[PDB]
PDB file of C-alpha atoms in Angstrom:
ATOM      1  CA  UNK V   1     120.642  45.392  14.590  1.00 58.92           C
ATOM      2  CA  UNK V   2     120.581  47.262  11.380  1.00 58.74           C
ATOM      3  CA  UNK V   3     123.036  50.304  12.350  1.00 60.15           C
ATOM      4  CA  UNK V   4     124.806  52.531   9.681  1.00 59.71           C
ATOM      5  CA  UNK V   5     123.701  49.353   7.311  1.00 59.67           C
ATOM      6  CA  UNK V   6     120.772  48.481   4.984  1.00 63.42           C
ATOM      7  CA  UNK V   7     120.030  45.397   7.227  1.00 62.70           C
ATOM      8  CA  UNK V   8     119.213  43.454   9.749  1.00 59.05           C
ATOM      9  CA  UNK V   9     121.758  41.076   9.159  1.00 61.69           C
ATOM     10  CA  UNK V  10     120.748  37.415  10.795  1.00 58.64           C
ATOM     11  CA  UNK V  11     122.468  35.460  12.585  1.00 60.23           C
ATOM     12  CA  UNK V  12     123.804  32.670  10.445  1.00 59.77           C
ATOM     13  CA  UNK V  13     125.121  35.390   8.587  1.00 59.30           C
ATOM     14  CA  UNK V  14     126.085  37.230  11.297  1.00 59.41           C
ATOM     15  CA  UNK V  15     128.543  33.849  12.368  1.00 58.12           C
ATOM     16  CA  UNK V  16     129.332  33.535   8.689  1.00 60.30           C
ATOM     17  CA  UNK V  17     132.043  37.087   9.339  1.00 57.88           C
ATOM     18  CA  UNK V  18     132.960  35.193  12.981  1.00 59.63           C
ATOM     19  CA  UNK V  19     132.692  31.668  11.659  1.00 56.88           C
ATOM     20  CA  UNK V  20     129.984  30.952  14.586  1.00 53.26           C
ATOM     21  CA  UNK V  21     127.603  28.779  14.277  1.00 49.71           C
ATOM     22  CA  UNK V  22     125.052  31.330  15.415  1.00 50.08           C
ATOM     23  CA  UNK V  23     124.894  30.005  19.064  1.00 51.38           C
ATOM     24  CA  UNK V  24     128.310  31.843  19.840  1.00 51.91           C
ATOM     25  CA  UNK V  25     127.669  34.839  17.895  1.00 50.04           C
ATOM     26  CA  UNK V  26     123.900  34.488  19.932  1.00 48.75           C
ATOM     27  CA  UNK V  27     125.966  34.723  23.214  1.00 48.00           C
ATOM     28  CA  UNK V  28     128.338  37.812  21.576  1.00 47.28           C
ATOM     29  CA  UNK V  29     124.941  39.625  21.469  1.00 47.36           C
ATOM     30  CA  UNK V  30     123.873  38.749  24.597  1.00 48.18           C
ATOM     31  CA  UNK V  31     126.524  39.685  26.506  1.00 47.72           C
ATOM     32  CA  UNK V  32     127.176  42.936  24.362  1.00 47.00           C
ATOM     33  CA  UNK V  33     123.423  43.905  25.678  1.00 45.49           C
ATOM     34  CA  UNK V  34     124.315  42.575  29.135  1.00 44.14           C
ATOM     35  CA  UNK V  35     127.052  45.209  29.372  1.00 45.46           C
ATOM     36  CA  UNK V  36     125.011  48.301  28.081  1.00 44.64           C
ATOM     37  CA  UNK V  37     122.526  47.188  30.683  1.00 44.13           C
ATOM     38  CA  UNK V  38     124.714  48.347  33.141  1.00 47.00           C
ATOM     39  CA  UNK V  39     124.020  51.762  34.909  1.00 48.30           C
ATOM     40  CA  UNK V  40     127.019  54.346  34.176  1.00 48.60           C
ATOM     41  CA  UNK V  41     127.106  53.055  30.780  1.00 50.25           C
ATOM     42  CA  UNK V  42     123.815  53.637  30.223  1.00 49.21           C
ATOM     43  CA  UNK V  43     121.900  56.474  31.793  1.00 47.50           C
ATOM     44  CA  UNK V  44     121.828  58.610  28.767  1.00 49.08           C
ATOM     45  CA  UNK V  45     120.280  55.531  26.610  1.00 46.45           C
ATOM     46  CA  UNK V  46     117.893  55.391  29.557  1.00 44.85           C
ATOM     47  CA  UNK V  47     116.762  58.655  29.448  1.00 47.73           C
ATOM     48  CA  UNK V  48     115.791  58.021  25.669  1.00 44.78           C
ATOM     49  CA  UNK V  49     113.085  55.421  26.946  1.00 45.34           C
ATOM     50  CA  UNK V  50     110.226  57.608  26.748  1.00 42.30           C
ATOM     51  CA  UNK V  51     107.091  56.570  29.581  1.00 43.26           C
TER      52      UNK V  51
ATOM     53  CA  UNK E   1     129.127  58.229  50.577  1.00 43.69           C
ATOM     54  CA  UNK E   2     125.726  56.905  48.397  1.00 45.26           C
ATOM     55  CA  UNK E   3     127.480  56.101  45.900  1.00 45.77           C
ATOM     56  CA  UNK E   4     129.858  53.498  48.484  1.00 48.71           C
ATOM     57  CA  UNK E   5     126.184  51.599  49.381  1.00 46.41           C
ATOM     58  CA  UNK E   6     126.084  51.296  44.985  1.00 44.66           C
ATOM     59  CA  UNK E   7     126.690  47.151  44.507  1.00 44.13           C
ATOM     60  CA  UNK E   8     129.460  45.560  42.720  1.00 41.90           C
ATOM     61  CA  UNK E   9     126.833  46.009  40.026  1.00 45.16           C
ATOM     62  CA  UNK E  10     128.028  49.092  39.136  1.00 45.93           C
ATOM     63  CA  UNK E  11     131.600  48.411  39.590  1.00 45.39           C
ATOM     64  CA  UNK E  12     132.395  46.996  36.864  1.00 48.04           C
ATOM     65  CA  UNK E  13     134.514  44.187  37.437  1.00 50.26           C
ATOM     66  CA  UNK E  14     135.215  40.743  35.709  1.00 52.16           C
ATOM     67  CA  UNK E  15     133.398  37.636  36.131  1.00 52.26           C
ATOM     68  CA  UNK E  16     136.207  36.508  38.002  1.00 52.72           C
ATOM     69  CA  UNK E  17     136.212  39.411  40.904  1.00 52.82           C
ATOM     70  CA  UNK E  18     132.105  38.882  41.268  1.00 50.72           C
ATOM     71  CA  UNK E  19     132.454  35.109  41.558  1.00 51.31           C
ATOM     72  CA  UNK E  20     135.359  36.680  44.860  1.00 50.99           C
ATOM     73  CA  UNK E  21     132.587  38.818  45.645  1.00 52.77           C
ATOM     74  CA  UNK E  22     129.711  36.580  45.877  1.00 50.56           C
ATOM     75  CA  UNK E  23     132.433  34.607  47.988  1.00 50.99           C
ATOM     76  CA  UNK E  24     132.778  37.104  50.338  1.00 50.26           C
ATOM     77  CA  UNK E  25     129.375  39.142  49.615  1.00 51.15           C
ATOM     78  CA  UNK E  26     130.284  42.642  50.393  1.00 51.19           C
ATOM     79  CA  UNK E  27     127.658  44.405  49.475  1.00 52.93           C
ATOM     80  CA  UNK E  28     128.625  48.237  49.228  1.00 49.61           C
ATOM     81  CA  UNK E  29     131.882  49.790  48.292  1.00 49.92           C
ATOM     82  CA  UNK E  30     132.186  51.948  51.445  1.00 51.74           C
ATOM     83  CA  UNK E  31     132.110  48.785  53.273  1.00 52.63           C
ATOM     84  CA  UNK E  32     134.869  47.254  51.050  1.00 56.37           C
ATOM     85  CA  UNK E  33     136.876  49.988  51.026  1.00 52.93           C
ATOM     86  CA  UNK E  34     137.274  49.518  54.864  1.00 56.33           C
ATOM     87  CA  UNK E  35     139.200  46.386  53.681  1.00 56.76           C
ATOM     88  CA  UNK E  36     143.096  46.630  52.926  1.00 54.10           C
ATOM     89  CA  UNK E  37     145.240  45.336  50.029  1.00 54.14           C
ATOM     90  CA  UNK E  38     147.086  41.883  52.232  1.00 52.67           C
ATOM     91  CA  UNK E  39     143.275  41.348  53.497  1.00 49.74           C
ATOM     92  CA  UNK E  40     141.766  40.964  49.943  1.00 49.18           C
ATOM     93  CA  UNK E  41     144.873  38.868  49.136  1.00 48.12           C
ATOM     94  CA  UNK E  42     143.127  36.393  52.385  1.00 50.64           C
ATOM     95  CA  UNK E  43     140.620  35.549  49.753  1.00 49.85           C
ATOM     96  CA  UNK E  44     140.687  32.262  47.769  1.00 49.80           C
ATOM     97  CA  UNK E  45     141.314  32.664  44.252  1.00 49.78           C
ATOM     98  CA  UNK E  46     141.417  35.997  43.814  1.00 43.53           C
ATOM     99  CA  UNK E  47     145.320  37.130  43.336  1.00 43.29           C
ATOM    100  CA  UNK E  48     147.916  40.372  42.222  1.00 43.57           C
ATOM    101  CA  UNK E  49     146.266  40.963  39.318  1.00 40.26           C
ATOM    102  CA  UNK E  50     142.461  40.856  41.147  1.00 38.53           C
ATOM    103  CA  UNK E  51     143.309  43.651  43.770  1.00 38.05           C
ATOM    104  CA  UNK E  52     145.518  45.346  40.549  1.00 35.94           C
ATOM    105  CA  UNK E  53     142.293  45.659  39.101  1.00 35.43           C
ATOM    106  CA  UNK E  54     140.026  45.985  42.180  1.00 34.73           C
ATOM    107  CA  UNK E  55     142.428  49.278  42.793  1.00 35.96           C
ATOM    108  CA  UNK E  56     141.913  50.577  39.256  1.00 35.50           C
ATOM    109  CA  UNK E  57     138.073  50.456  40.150  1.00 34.27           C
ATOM    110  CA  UNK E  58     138.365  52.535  43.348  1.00 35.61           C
ATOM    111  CA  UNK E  59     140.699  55.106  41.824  1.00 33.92           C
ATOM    112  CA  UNK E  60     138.011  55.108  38.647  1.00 34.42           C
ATOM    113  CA  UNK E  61     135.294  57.014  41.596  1.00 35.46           C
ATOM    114  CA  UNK E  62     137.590  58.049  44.112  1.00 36.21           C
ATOM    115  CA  UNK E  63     137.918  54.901  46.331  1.00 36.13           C
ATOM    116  CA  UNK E  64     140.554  53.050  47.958  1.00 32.93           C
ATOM    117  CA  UNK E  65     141.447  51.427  50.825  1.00 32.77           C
ATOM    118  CA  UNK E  66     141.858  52.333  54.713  1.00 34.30           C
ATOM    119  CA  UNK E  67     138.306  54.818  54.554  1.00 30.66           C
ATOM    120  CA  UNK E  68     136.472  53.292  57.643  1.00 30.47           C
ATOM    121  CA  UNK E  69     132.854  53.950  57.438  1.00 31.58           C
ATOM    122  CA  UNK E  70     130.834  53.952  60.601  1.00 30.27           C
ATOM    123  CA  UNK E  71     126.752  53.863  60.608  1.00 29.94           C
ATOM    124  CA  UNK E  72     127.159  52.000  57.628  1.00 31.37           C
ATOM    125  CA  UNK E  73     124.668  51.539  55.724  1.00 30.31           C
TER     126      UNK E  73
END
């Protein structure tokens, strides 16, 4: 994501700092948003979402 | 306690302790909390440093062994 950073980096050059091929650094990301999607961690975040 | 029918979800344990849990499928804390520290150690797989860490969880929200629920859930 593009946090304290003018980008929106991608994900070859994402794996390009970690030297993953992009499927790794994929999974990094996934399981980085799998863990925030945990209640506990997350309530506050949820009461950002707006509906 | 409603927070002792809250999953292993919000535990927050490895992938190692769910793959015990889904094992042995106890649901809600208050009903694993029942459970002692030799009968965990019964499980398959699952050794010191699994009930090391299963005992950091409970004393994370207050839980621990020996606390038998009744009525539960």
């Amino acid at each position: 994501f593009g946090i304290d950073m003018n980008t929106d980096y991608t994900l070859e050059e994402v794996g390009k700092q970690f030297d993953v091929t992009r499927e790794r650094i994929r999974q990094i990301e996934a399981k980085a948003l799998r863990k925030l999607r945990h209640p506990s961690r997350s309530e506050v975040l949820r009461s950002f979402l707006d509906d | 306690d409603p927070i002792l029918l809250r999953p292993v979800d919000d535990l927050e344990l490895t992938v190692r302790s769910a793959n015990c849990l889904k094992a042995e499928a106890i649901h809600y804390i208050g009903d694993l909390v029942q459970r002692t520290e030799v009968e965990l150690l019964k499980t398959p797989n699952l050794g010191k440093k699994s009930l090391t860490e299963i005992k950091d969880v409970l004393a994370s929200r207050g839980l621990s062994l020996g606390m038998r629920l009744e009525n539960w859930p």
